[PDB]
């Protein structure tokens, strides 16, 4: 039975088990990934009003001096750009990425998102014709089972991942492992079924429209943003946008007791319809940078328009 | 049918037989890069471009003996590998060499057949394509969507004019949007013929999905020989983005004002809805990497199209 969203933990929401599932608010748990850092700002005067806790760390300045500064003297160079490349009313799913060179942290990506009033920035440590190679023999496969192994080789080879399964939706929400490349001695998932309540409800339609998405470590606390509420709503600040955002509690145990350390996954799109996922295991923790994510992401795409010509090609 | 091309004495095209030039075996490349073709399974070199002397820096004779094996040890058991016997002419493998006479050359393989075709050109070696991604998937309509692509390609590109053309049901074309250098005419709204970008033309742009003119005032440079020797027959050159470029259609590149031109096919349910078209008023030889961008964003523009054109109808 679909129901609506229970508050979460820190506004005296209830704890979650098998049996509300499908009611954690998953996009605003108030936290993120320790390997990265999180602000929130202003849409138009650009004062930063949130930063998750580790921001110091990563940026090299106090708290109150940066919620002291407005992005426009924090971000002179990108501040312009960012305010012409995610204008007011643009959807929540725009990103515009850049490449920042930090005196303290080395280089640093940058990605900036939009939601109503409030911009997100996100920073993560960032670092030859394998995707165009990739690209041509995608097309080239003769049909479907083909596509599938030759997605699921390219993606471990560019990744080194243990694991790299395409996952398949059912009509019922049920899936189905129809394709994998694994480091030798894991045992197989290929063929497996698991039930709808495996990847709840709430989670395949934010998948349907944020298409990446990983826990880099399923041991590591999450840090909060301080304050935990957005100051110009007293409410949430939506994160579901926000590949940092902490991963809930009930599936980061679910690895755990999998044996696995790192996750990774995109989502393949047909008809804009949720139709799989690109699954990605390592049994260690295990940090993507953020270049390498965007060639994945880019093979999301290729793979969406794909599927959709194999399968038309089947009748 | 296809006339036979000129070198094998068939008749000179007009406008009354544009449907049957055979714009796949003109038996000549671009000379802003070399090429080779080469046994699938012997690795020797059966034609060169006449200028492979300069790109190589290799004594002519030198290379009509040598062997893949030997000219790229590094390369050829990949080749082999990402090319087998019996794969689609579409399917194509790149490396960047850094070769003693030339800094970087990319090279760009495919198979037809029993030969594998190789190109050469210069090469070098950030967020933009990110950036243009995520523009282009929250474009709200087929309209903005056609104007961020076209903006989205002159900002890659610096191409003086880049147009978004549709093709209608008898295969009738429509600039539909357009992002232009000012001080060019605007061909904004206007329609032109089907038979402007003719029948064949279209059936080679279904399947190799990318190709340009660098200059449209440069000769050709020929294959030697000419005919394959593994058939006595002519190389199909259709994969080749080097592969000379119709005498008819510079002629209207010429007459037009354009020295440099460049289009991307727009594919939809295994159909050419259109191209991203791209002019410059000078000559201008657009790097190997630049031109992959390009690949990609015609990809997405037409995953982007199908989805767009579903929530109208
Ligand atoms: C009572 C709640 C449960 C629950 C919560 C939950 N699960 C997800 C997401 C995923 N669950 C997956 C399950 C699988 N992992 C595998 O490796 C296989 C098969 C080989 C299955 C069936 C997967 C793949 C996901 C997606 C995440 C990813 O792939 O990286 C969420 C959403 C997480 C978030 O947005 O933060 C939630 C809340 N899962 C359960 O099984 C029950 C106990
Ligand atoms: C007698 C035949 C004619 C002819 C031949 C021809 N045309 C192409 C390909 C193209 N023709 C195009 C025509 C246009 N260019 C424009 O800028 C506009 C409108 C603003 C039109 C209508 C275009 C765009 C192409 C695509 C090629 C490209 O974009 O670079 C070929 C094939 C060339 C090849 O494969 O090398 C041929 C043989 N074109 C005519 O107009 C008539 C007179």
Not at 108 to 114: A, G, K, P
Not at 238 to 250: C, D, F, H, I, K
Not at 271 to 286: D, K, N, R, S, V
Request: charged letters at 15%.
């Amino acid at each position: 039975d679909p129901l609506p969203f229970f508050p979460p933990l820190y506004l005296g929401g209830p704890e979650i088990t098998t049996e509300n599932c499908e009611r954690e608010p998953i996009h605003i748990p108030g936290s993120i990934q320790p390997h990265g850092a999180l602000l929130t700002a202003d849409g138009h005067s650009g004062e930063v009003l949130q930063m998750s806790l580790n921001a110091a760390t990563f940026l090299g300045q106090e708290p109150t001096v940066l919620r002291g500064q407005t992005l426009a003297a924090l971000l002179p160079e990108q501040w312009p750009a960012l305010q012409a490349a995610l204008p007011p009313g643009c959807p929540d799913a725009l990103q515009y990425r850049a490449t920042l060179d930090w005196p303290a942290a080395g280089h640093l990506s940058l990605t900036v998102h939009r939601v109503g009033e409030l911009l997100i920035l996100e920073f993560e440590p960032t670092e030859p014709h394998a995707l165009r190679n990739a690209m041509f023999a995608l097309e080239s496969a003769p049909n479907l089972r083909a596509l599938a192994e030759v997605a699921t080789q390219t993606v471990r080879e560019l990744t080194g991942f243990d694991r790299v399964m395409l996952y398949k939706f059912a009509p019922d929400a049920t899936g189905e492992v129809i394709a994998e490349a694994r480091r030798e001695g894991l045992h197989a998932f290929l063929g497996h079924r698991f039930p709808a309540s495996d990847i709840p409800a709430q989670a395949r339609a934010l998948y349907t429209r944020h298409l990446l998405r990983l826990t880099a470590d399923t041991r590591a606390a999450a840090v909060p943003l301080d304050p935990v509420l957005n100051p110009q709503t007293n409410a949430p600040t939506p994160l579901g946008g926000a590949v940092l955002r902490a991963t809930s509690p009930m599936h980061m145990q679910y690895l755990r007791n999998m044996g696995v350390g790192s996750s990774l996954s995109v989502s393949v799109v047909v008809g804009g319809q949720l139709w799989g996922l690109i699954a990605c295991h390592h049994q260690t923790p295990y940090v993507l940078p953020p270049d390498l994510r965007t060639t994945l992401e880019y093979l999301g795409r290729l793979l969406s328009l794909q599927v959709q010509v194999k399968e038309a090609l089947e009748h």
